[PDB]
Design a protein around this nucleic acid. Structure first.
Ligand SMILES: [Mg+2]
Ligand SMILES: [Mg+2]
Ligand SMILES: [Mg+2]
Ligand SMILES: [Mg+2]
Ligand code: NA
Length: 140
RNA sequence: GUUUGACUGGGGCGGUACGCGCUCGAAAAGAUAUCGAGCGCGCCCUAUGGCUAUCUCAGCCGGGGACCCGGCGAAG
């Protein structure tokens, strides 16, 4: 049963929602791989009327690139609880989000016969705290 | 020397139902009138055309009315 039910980290998104950049550089070094532009939608008063327009960058890290990052990110954060997803996710911080899920996630991310992950097989906030807390730190 | 139009609950004034498109009137095929009700067209676009690749939207919810992550979401 287990082994295929135990959580794992799937991508960590580090993004700097600026409002118009030079910031990429630090993201590249803090993570280790090229950042991606963040275009914006809708015209608005913060002199942000431009639809297609660089207004920040993000970096999706997977596997080791994600751990080797969290092995310094987490320590720089304290928070826990309430600040957790209903799906077992959590964002802290410049933002750093951690998407958590169990072994059969590809089923909902592939092209052929894809399918939505059953609520039961979903990751709960609690089942999440456990996994992570059980990895160099403490909850609340 | 001539012209100075037509429509119209007489004619004139007003209007254009004088060329076109849609809903309703229209009576569950088609056709169907009034100066019937609601309201539009006389363009604009070198992309706002064409194809291919990749992709899924409104709105709401939860985590850090811009941006980022997840979730619900046949279509508003
Ligand atoms: Mg004569
Ligand atoms: Mg005369
Ligand atoms: Mg007459
Ligand atoms: Mg008929
Ligand atoms: Na005439």
């Amino acid at each position: 049963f287990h082994e295929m039910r135990e959580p794992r980290i799937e991508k960590v998104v580090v993004h700097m929602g600026i409002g118009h950049a030079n910031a990429e550089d630090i993201l590249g070094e803090i993570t280790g791989q090229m950042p991606v532009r963040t275009k914006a939608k809708r015209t608005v008063g913060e002199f942000d009327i431009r639809e297609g327009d660089p207004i920040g960058a993000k970096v999706t890290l997977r596997d080791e690139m994600a751990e080797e990052f969290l092995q310094t990110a987490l320590p720089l954060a304290e928070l826990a609880t309430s600040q957790f997803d209903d799906t077992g996710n959590f964002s802290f911080g410049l933002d750093v989000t951690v998407n958590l899920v169990r072994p059969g996630y590809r089923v909902a991310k592939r092209d052929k016969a894809s399918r939505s992950i059953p609520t039961k097989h979903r990751l709960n906030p609690a089942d999440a705290v456990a996994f992570i807390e059980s990895t160099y730190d403490v909850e609340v």
